[PDB]
Design a protein around this nucleic acid. Structure first.
Lengths: 482, 79
DNA sequence: GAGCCCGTAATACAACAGATTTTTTCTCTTAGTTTTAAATTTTTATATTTCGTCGA
DNA sequence: GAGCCCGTAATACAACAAAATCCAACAAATA
DNA sequence: TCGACGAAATATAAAAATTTAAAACTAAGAGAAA
DNA sequence: TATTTGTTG
DNA sequence: GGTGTTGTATTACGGGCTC
DNA sequence: GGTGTTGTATTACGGGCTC
């Protein structure tokens, strides 16, 4: 840079004296040089692949003791294209090409000496974002989930749009005092200066004031009436629907487990509005590691581990939810949207398998499992095996057909088949749709299977489950419906 | 625990399945499908009193048949 | 300086500092239990496999 | 050399090294 | 040495009816190791 | 007079 | 692939004075 | 009155040679 000939009267050639042993005219009063050489050379380094008339050794120049002031002066003088900028950016750009043993001390010494030459007069005593304005929200209905945990607190950052699902103990017992403890338990990130939770008027924020007076933070948790201009209410509305979808799943190994994965996936998806994903809207790094290795079960020391990891790859469900609700299509095209179906793929058929009856306040929408298609009659009559061919129990119209039963990666569990299968897999359920109107048969959603598939239960194996909550939620769904 | 007892049985099934596959020369995904069929068989109250080689041979055959291949039952029964 | 051999001889560095049971999960090993399905018979027409024998 | 003030600023030195039961046995405290 | 036939082995769906494993499933018992 | 309970190699 | 690591009194080294 | 202390590899310093 400044010169191609190094000054030998410094520590550079004395470090170069590691194994080549050129010459030793170190310096006047060189007590520091030889101890530095022996210590920082014999112990660990063994670096500096020696070169003739070069100081490249790493990929950074080893600037001499005599030359450092001149190169820093040429690097800092704004008239000489140096900028006279801050310490951090100059320190960053000064060491991809320069080594400078004890670079930081030299930089801070030069800054504290040259500050008299160029004084800075920023005001010391007496504007939003990054954990300054924060808002937390509650959820309404939620199952007890094996430990009486029926609460979820989402805490939405007003600026970074980052959420945190916490306070999963109780609906009222963790609402007076322990909500302060939970805000304190994720407040190790920081203490926000304003909280605008906007749920209800509370006796809380008086004990919150007590903690922030026991400490020195000037925080406030007023939340007078509401912040509602255009979007934060929309953010609350779209947030709770996903949490109600978590409510609509996972009745064992419940949402109180694997909720951090849900938070990671939510803050990992790009917003597509005004920017990028929450882990890079304020943090700027950390790729999500999307691969979870949902394969190689034959090479596995713990098969429960690979089963739960295959469950962990259910992030596709969340991404599909937030993509389809990011949530419409072209009108009047849906009549022509059924297309030509090739022979071989599994076909899902509607309620009228062989009997069409008055299903129990029907929200299942196709009501049975898939079958295989072997032949087609016309454009509106397809043959696929359901029952024996007596009284034409083989062909139905295309209005009673669908297409898609795929992605076993997102849905690990298979289709249960027998009652003795059902007895053992009974304690893995998601939802209950409605009793079959014929005599007594139950229709249910199982866990880790796609919602299009359905599994039939009778009263024989229905007595070995937590089914109290199942017909409870069916009763309140009926109350909502009628 | 209830989940603890499953792991030893699955490990024994994997060991026997790999032992037969070492002589059958079948690819990895066929063995993976065979092991998931063995998991389904245990979920269906797996047939007790049967010989161990019979059920693993059935699972290996149905896995090798679910994708069009060439293995024959004599190769399963060649000891 | 500059190093080397070798023969003595100093030289900081660390062990003696009460020792043992528990505490909380986990992971092979090895013996006892439980549910369940299977070894020899009738049998009935069907069909293909594999011996087994016979013939010119 | 010779020392001093003062202001930073390096500098070996040790703590995290699982936690907590007693063992055997002196002498205080009642009842 | 190609043709000609006999014949047990299976499925098969029941009712059955004594013995034989037999492999999931518990449960000590040791051995780790912060 | 037996059963305790402080502290210490 | 896998193998120390910072908190802390304590102490050493430059600007400015006497030379 | 009463309060560290040696065993041990490891390494540093003189006679005798080359200078």
């Amino acid at each position: 840079y400044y010169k191609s000939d190094p000054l030998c009267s410094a520590v550079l050639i004395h470090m170069k004296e590691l194994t080549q042993h050129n010459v030793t005219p170190e310096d006047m009063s060189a007590f520091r040089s030889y101890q530095k050489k022996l210590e920082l050379s014999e112990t660990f380094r063994k670096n500096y692949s020696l070169e003739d008339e070069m100081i490249y050794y790493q990929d950074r120049l080893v600037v001499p003791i005599k030359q450092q002031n001149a190169v820093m002066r040429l690097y800092h003088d704004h008239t000489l294209f140096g900028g006279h900028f801050g310490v951090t950016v100059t320190l960053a750009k000064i060491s991809p090409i320069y080594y400078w043993p004890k670079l930081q001390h030299s930089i801070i010494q030069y800054i504290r000496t040259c500050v008299q030459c160029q004084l800075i007069k920023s005001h010391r005593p007496r504007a939003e974002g990054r954990w300054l304005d924060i808002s937390m929200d509650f959820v309404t209905g939620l199952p007890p989930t094996s430990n009486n945990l029926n609460m979820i607190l989402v805490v939405v950052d007003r600026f970074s749009k980052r959420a945190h699902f916490i306070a999963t103990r109780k609906t009222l017992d963790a609402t007076q005092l322990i909500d302060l403890l939970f805000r304190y338990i994720f407040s190790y990130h920081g203490f926000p200066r304003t909280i605008t939770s906007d749920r209800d008027v509370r006796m809380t924020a008086d004990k919150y004031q007590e903690l922030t007076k026991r400490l020195g933070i000037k925080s406030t948790m007023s939340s007078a009436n509401h912040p509602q201009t255009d979007g934060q209410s929309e953010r609350t509305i779209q947030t709770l629907n996903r949490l109600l979808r978590a409510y609509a799943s996972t009745n064992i190994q419940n949402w109180h487990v694997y909720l951090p994965q849900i938070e990671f996936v939510y803050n990992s998806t790009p917003t597509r509005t005004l920017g990028k994903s929450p882990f890079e809207i304020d943090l700027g790094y950390l790729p999500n590691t999307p691969a979870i290795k949902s394969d190689d079960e034959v090479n596995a020391r713990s098969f429960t581990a690979v089963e739960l990891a295959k469950h962990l790859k259910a992030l596709t469900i969340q991404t599909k939810e937030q993509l389809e609700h990011a949530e419409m299509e072209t009108n009047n095209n849906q009549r022509r949207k059924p297309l030509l179906l090739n022979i071989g793929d599994h076909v899902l058929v509607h309620r009228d398998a062989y009997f069409k009856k008055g299903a129990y306040m029907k929200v299942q929408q196709i009501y049975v499992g898939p079958f295989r298609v072997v032949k087609k009659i016309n454009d509106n009559a397809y043959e696929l095996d359901l029952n024996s061919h007596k009284k034409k129990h083989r062909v139905i119209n295309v209005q009673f057909l669908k297409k898609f039963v795929y992605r076993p990666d997102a849905y690990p569990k298979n289709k249960p088949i027998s009652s003795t299968e059902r007895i053992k897999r009974a304690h893995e359920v998601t939802a209950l749709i409605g009793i079959d109107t014929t005599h007594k048969t139950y229709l249910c959603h199982m866990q880790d299977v796609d919602p299009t598939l359905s599994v039939e239960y009778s009263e024989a194996e229905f007595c070995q489950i937590p089914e109290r909550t199942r017909r409870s939620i069916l009763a309140n769904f009926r109350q909502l419906y009628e | 625990s209830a989940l603890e007892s499953r792991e030893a049985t699955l490990n024994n099934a994997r060991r026997k399945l790999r032992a037969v596959s070492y002589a059958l020369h079948i690819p990895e995904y066929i063995t993976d499908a065979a092991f998931q069929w063995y998991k389904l068989a245990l979920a269906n109250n797996f047939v007790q009193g049967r010989r161990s080689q019979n059920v693993i041979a059935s699972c290996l055959y149905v896995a090798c048949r679910k994708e069009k291949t060439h293995h024959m039952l004599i190769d399963f029964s060649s000891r």
